[PDB]
Design a protein around this ligand. Sequence first.
Ligand SMILES: OC[C@H]1O[C@H](O)[C@@H](O)[C@@H](O)[C@@H]1O
Ligand SMILES: OC[C@H]1O[C@H](O)[C@@H](O)[C@@H](O)[C@@H]1O
Ligand SMILES: [Ca+2]
Ligand SMILES: [Ca+2]
Ligand SMILES: [Mn+2]
Ligand SMILES: [Mn+2]
Lengths: 240, 240
Amino acid sequence: QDSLSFGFPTFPSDQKNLIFQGDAQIKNNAVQLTKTDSNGNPVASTVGRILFSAQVHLWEKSSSRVANFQSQFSFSLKSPLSNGADGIAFFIAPPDTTIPSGSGGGLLGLFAPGTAQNTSANQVIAVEFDTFYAQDSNTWDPNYPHIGIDVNSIRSVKTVKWDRRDGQSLNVLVTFNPSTRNLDVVATYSDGTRYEVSYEVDVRSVLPEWVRVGFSAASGEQYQTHTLESWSFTSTLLYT
Amino acid sequence: QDSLSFGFPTFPSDQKNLIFQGDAQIKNNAVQLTKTDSNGNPVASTVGRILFSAQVHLWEKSSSRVANFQSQFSFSLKSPLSNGADGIAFFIAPPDTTIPSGSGGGLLGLFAPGTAQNTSANQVIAVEFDTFYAQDSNTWDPNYPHIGIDVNSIRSVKTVKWDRRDGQSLNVLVTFNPSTRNLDVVATYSDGTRYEVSYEVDVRSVLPEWVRVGFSAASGEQYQTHTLESWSFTSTLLYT
Ligand SMILES: OC[C@H]1O[C@H](O)[C@@H](O)[C@@H](O)[C@@H]1O
Ligand SMILES: OC[C@H]1O[C@H](O)[C@@H](O)[C@@H](O)[C@@H]1O
Ligand SMILES: [Ca+2]
Ligand SMILES: [Ca+2]
Ligand SMILES: [Mn+2]
Ligand SMILES: [Mn+2]
C-alpha cells in the first residue's frame, strides 16, 4: 500500500499485529520492553523490541517517491537506582531485523559490538532516549542524558541535552518530510518542558524500499523499566 | 491497534502485505483474481483471493466497542462471452481462512458445497457482484445479475438488481456503522449509474473479534477476468 496508518491508544493483552522480540511483553495495557520481576520491578541484563507486523513502503525506486511519515508515542521510565539504564529507541530497519548477538546494554538492542560504529555495516535509523552515559563504557556518548538521532551507528549523528524524569510520561512526535529530507523530533513532558532536534537525511541511501518500524530498549548492569504507553503511526508515499 | 487504515491506489508487482490464495496474482498494476492465459484472456475453472496481512480488530468484548469501517474499491470484468461468470466479492472472515475445497464457480471461492447454505456452519460476511445466475447450478440466486450481501450463506440475505458492463470500472463504497448496525453498499459506474443495497447486521454475533479482509473471485465453466484496480480500507473501534 502507498499509505498505511495505525493507532494504539493503549496496548491490551490481546495483540495480533505486533512482533515481540527478546523480553518484550504486554503488561497492564502497556508494552514493557525490558523484563520486570513479579513485583513489576526492573532487572538487569534484558533486551526487548517490538515491531509492527505490516511492512511500510518507505520509498519506491520505480516512481521516484518517498514517504512522508509521522510517529507519535509516549513512554515512561522508572528505576529505584540513581543511574537507570540504558534507554529506549524508536527505530526503522529492514523487515527481517532481529536482535543482534551481544547488543545489550548501551547498544540498546540495535547494534552488534563489532560493528556498532561502522556506518557501512548497518541499516537503521533510530531516535534514542539515552539515560546512561558513563564515559568508561558508553565511550561514544556525550556526558549527560540525551536524545539522539542514530543513522547506522550507536554514535549519534546528533544529540541534544535531555532530562530523565522518573515515572513521568514523555510524549514524542517524530516526523520525516521527503521534500526537505528533514527528520524532526519534538518531545515534551506534561509541564510543557520541550526538547527539539532535527537532521537532514536521505532515507533512500540508508534503508531499503520496504521496512518495519518499532521500538527497542535494553538494560545492562544498571536498569529501569522502559514502558511504551501509546503509539500512532502514519506513512504515505509522495512525489519528490 | 484500535484503528487501522491502508490504501492501494494501484497494485505494483512488489507486494509485501498481501496474502495471495489460489490463482490470484498481480499483473499490469492490478490484481487479477482469476487466471488468464498468455494473451490476457480469462480461462475456465479458476479461483483466487487476496487478503491484507494485518488483522483487523472488528470488535472488542472487554470494552464493548465495535468498529466503524469503510472499504472503497474499484474493479472491472472482461469477457469474450456475453455471459461472463462467476463474480467477485469483498469479504471479511476469520484470519486463518483459506479457499474451501470445491468452492469454485458460483460458490465464488467462499463456501464449501456441502455447507454453502448452512448459516451455522460458516463465518463470513461478503458483498458479492454476481454475474451468473442459471437456476440449474446457482439455485440460490435471483434470476438476474445482482449485488448481494452474504451473511454466512451463498444465498444473499439482501440483493439489488445490477447491470454487468464489460470492461467498465465499477466504483464501490462499503460502510458499516456500529451505531445503527447498517452495512451499506453504494456502487457506481463512471456515468453516474448507481446501485445501493443495505442490511442490518450485528457483526459481533457472526465474526470473531479479529478478522482479515479481502477479495475473492471465481469462474466455473463460464468465465471473465476479475480485475481489482484499487482498494482503500479504514477501521476504527468506537463505543456506541
Ligand atoms: O547498564 C549500564 C551499562 O552496563 C554495562 O556496563 C554494559 O552492559 C553497558 O553496555 C551498559 O551501558
Ligand atoms: O461458471 C458458470 C457455472 O459453471 C458450472 O456450472 C459451475 O462451476 C457453476 O458453479 C458455475 O456457476
Ligand atoms: Ca548510552
Ligand atoms: Ca451466482
Ligand atoms: Mn547515546
Ligand atoms: Mn448471488
